[PDB]
Amino acid sequence: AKHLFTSESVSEGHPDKIADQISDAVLDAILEQDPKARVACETYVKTGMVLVGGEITTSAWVDIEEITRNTVREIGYVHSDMGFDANSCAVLSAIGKQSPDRADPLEQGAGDQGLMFGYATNETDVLMPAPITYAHRLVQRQAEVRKNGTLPWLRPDAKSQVTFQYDDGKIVGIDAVVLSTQHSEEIDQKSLQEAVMEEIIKPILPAEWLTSATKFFINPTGRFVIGGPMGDCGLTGRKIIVDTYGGMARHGGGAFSGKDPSKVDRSAAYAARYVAKNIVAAGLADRCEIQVSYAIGVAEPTSIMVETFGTEKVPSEQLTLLVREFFDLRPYGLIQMLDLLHPIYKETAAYGHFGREHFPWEKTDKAQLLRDAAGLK
Amino acid sequence: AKHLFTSESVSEGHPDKIADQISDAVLDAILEQDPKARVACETYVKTGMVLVGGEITTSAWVDIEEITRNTVREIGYVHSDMGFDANSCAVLSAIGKQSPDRADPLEQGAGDQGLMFGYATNETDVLMPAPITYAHRLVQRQAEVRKNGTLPWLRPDAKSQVTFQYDDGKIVGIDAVVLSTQHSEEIDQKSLQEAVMEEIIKPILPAEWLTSATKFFINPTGRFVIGGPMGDCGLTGRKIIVDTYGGMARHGGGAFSGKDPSKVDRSAAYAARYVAKNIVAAGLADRCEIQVSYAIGVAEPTSIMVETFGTEKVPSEQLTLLVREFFDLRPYGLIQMLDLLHPIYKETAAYGHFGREHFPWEKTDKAQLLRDAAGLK
Numbered sequence: 155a156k157h158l159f160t161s162e163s164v165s166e167g168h169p170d171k172i173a174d175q176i177s178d179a180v181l182d183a184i185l186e187q188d189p190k191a192r193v194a195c196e197t198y199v200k201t202g203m204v205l206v207g208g209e210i211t212t213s214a215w216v217d218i219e220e221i222t223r224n225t226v227r228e229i230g231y232v233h234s235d236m237g238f239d240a241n242s243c244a245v246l247s248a249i250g251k252q253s254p255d256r257a258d259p260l261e262q263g264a265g266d267q268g269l270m271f272g273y274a275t276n277e278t279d280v281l282m283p284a285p286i287t288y289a290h291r292l293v294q295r296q297a298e299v300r301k302n303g304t305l306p307w308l309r310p311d312a313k314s315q316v317t318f319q320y321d322d323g324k325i326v327g328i329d330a331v332v333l334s335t336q337h338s339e340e341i342d343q344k345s346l347q348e349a350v351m352e353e354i355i356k357p358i359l360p361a362e363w364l365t366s367a368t369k370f371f372i373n374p375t376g377r378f379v380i381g382g383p384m385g386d387c388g389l390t391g392r393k394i395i396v397d398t399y400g401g402m403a404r405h406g407g408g409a410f411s412g413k414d415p416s417k418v419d420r421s422a423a424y425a426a427r428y429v430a431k432n433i434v435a436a437g438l439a440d441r442c443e444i445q446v447s448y449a450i451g452v453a454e455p456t457s458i459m460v461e462t463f464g465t466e467k468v469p470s471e472q473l474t475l476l477v478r479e480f481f482d483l484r485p486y487g488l489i490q491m492l493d494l495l496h497p498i499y500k501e502t503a504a505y506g507h508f509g510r511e512h513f514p515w516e517k518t519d520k521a522q523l524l525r526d527a528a529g530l531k
Numbered sequence: 532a533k534h535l536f537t538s539e540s541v542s543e544g545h546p547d548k549i550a551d552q553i554s555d556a557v558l559d560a561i562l563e564q565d566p567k568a569r570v571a572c573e574t575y576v577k578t579g580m581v582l583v584g585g586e587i588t589t590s591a592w593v594d595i596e597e598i599t600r601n602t603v604r605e606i607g608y609v610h611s612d613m614g615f616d617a618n619s620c621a622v623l624s625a626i627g628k629q630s631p632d633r634a635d636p637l638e639q640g641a642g643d644q645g646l647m648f649g650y651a652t653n654e655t656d657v658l659m660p661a662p663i664t665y666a667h668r669l670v671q672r673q674a675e676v677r678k679n680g681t682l683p684w685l686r687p688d689a690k691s692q693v694t695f696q697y698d699d700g701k702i703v704g705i706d707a708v709v710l711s712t713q714h715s716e717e718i719d720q721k722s723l724q725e726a727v728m729e730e731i732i733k734p735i736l737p738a739e740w741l742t743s744a745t746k747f748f749i750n751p752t753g754r755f756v757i758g759g760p761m762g763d764c765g766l767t768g769r770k771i772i773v774d775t776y777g778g779m780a781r782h783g784g785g786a787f788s789g790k791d792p793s794k795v796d797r798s799a800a801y802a803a804r805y806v807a808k809n810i811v812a813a814g815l816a817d818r819c820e821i822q823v824s825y826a827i828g829v830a831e832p833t834s835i836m837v838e839t840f841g842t843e844k845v846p847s848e849q850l851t852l853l854v855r856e857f858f859d860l861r862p863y864g865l866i867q868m869l870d871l872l873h874p875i876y877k878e879t880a881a882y883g884h885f886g887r888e889h890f891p892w893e894k895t896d897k898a899q900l901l902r903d904a905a906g907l908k
């Protein structure tokens with residue numbers, strides 16, 4: 155049935171994502187010195203200031219003010235005219251530090267309750283949904299041409315959104331595409347939209363998908379000149395959907411950034427992506443969404459649910475059998491299954507946690523073994 | 532097919548929700564003096580402090596420090612031993628104020644891009660999903676018996692989670708229920724769990740749903756004595772799922788609290804709940820989820836999608852016909868359709884935005900007219 159679906163993405167330097175990137179940059183910094191560190195680092199940004207606020211239990215010593223300024227500088231906010239300068243903004247920390255003091259470590263219970271969901275679909279190369287994939291790819295391309303000299307009047311803040319017409323389950327094409335970019339006072343609006351259309355949109359959206367009818371809204375109100383934290387406000391854990399799957403699949407509440415791996419909110423979600431992506435790569439289903447939940451102090455998950463939406467190649471009884479076998483979903487088990495105690499997290503914080511094959515949760519190593527046990531074919 | 536699903540909720544006084552309630556309390560206060568005010572008030576709480584941070588364009592004058600302290604006092608954090616005192620904590624504001632300066636007001640375009648989803652299901656009295664409904668009802672009952680003298684050793688912070696076994700689409704019963712409550716040093720753990728079980732859980736969970744097998748985890752690690760902001764950290768827009776539908780249905784990124792009605796993130800989502808709830812009350816479907824999206828500076832929605840999951844009583848072509856007719860979904864139209872410019876928002880910020888019939892988006896006034904035009908029956 156023809157039906158349209160939308161997903162947005164934002165760039166590095168959109169204020170919410172700045173806050174994510176700072177949080178995960180502090181996480182990485184601590185993890186580099188102490189991979190067993192427990193962190194929950196929440197960050198807030200507003201026109202003058204970055205507040206980095208936290209509970210951290212670690213041996214490590216790390217410089218919050220330095221880490222912050224460097225993250226704001228790579229994003230590019232380095233002069234008042236943009237909205238925000240990494241070298242003169244205020245950095246404020248309010249992190250509580252604690253230093254450290256079951257027979258099988260794997261049987262350690264979950265710290266905090268909750269629900270996590272994970273998804274895969276055979277509709278892109280990366281086994282991710284088409285909308286959120288291209289949506290991210292628009293903003294990423296913007297950052298690229300910004301940062302490579304090509305289109306250097308572009309400034310950091312940018313939002314993208316793409317709407318896709320599907321008829322059933324086939325992506326038929328792109329109905330509308332919207333893109334808004336901060337830019338210097340230097341460039342005119344009409345020349346801006348020539349360049350966005352040539353350099354950003356045309357190299358990313360598949361041409362077969364683009365029609366005579368495709369409604370493109372480039373800088374629709376726009377003269378987007380100041381942006382980033384200037385006059386807006388970013389907090390970690392607000393681009394929760396963008397981070398995930400653009401609203402194709404579901405979500406339990408939870409944020410990833412600034413949480414070390416002991417946090418099921420993060421690591422359970424990462425593991426869920428991995429179990430689903432492996433299922434689809436083995437051809438056990440076309441589209442798979444999984445809910446796993448935990449209760450505080452219990453180590454086995456309180457629930458698993460697989461929704462293969464009528465797209466199975468083996469009945470869900472057998473499917474849920476293999477899920478709960480090939481994958482250790484005890485909190486410390488999934489930390490092991492995916493080898494998470496490593497500074498790999500700042501890269502996660504812009505452009506989507508999933509869909510980028512070089513992440514431990516994006517590997518399809520278990521594809522065949524799943525294929526086998528699920529009645530080989 | 533038997534399959535389990537989970538949803539969590541938290542109380543007023545869980546730190547994220549404190550921050551929500553403060554944001555919406557400032558919204559209400561401004562709206563009482565100036566209903567056309569534009570606000571985006573983001574709040575952060577950590578052990579000593581509340582940072583209320585914002586952009587506000589209004590004539591009104593309102594006292595942030597007073598509003599804050601009063602909200603923290605009704606929640607109950609009024610002494611250091613709890614974790615946090617409303618009368619001695621630090622309140623810090625960083626709100627930018629601006630005072631004010633198409634032929635049809637209704638045709639005014641959307642301010643910001645985005646996607647919103649809304650849901651209804653005939654599975655509860657309130658046309659909301661069973662899990663998130665009971666989950667909320669657990670925490671609400673906790674707050675009630677806390678606040679009515681009955682169980683007065685209870686302190687503010689509490690989390691609940693209920694997992695439901697469904698066989699297909701029938702809620703069969705409650706597999707597990709978990710509940711964790713802050714409490715005074717005064718009460719013992721075992722007597723605590725007698726009382727939680729008698730007074731909170733037993734009057735809320737339907738007994739027919741409770742089995743010999745129902746795994747109840749009351750205070751599982753627990754001696755939860757300090758809580759609220761003490762040693763944790765709350766930010767508005769983190770209980771995004773709880774707010775909604777406990778992960779039964781989808782979400783675009785977006786937070787509600789501290790956003791005045793011009794924000795589609797909020798009002799479009801509210802309107803979507805209303806269009807779906809009306810569809811289901813008219814018996815046009817059993818379960819209905821709707822995605823509506825907007826692009827900045829356009830007034831008609833860029834997409835509408837209805838997923839009636841094989842539960843229609845009329846084909847989705849006709850359904851999407853009636854949706855886009857009976858409901859004005861232009862930003863100013865939905866503000867009108869639901870009469871939103873009123874201080875009604877602090878009540879929204881704990882216990883769920885939906886499912887509570889006395890909200891303008893919970894009315895089923897359009898039920899019959901939808902029934903009619905969708906081929907009367």
Ligand SMILES: Nc1ncnc2c1ncn2[C@@H]1O[C@H](COP(=O)(O)OP(=O)(O)O)[C@@H](O)[C@H]1O
Binds near residue numbers: 209762769
């Ligand atoms: N001292 C600490 N060190 C590291 N992480 C912590 C510490 N205190 C809090 N956290 C954890 O980090 C997580 C981030 O908070 P959050 O997910 O917001 O809780 P909730 O999901 O209930 O809102 C918490 O679940 C909490 O267990």
Ligand SMILES: Nc1ncnc2c1ncn2[C@@H]1O[C@H](COP(=O)(O)OP(=O)(O)O)[C@@H](O)[C@H]1O
Binds near residue numbers: 386570
């Ligand atoms: N001065 C202002 N007055 C009121 N609301 C504002 C003002 N500045 C920002 N806001 C609005 O409040 C909304 C809340 O921010 P947010 O939803 O986080 O943007 P995004 O969805 O891109 O993250 C913004 O979409 C923005 O349009």
Ligand SMILES: [K+]
Binds near residue numbers: 391392407768769
């Ligand atoms: K969020």
Ligand SMILES: [K+]
Binds near residue numbers: 177194391410413
């Ligand atoms: K965090």
Ligand SMILES: [K+]
Binds near residue numbers: 573767788
């Ligand atoms: K807000």
Ligand SMILES: [Mg+2]
Binds near residue numbers: 170387388389
């Ligand atoms: Mg935001």
Ligand SMILES: [Mg+2]
Binds near residue numbers: 266268408419
């Ligand atoms: Mg969480």
Ligand SMILES: [Mg+2]
Binds near residue numbers: 547764765766769
């Ligand atoms: Mg939180």
Ligand SMILES: [Mg+2]
Binds near residue numbers: 645784785786796
């Ligand atoms: Mg938004």
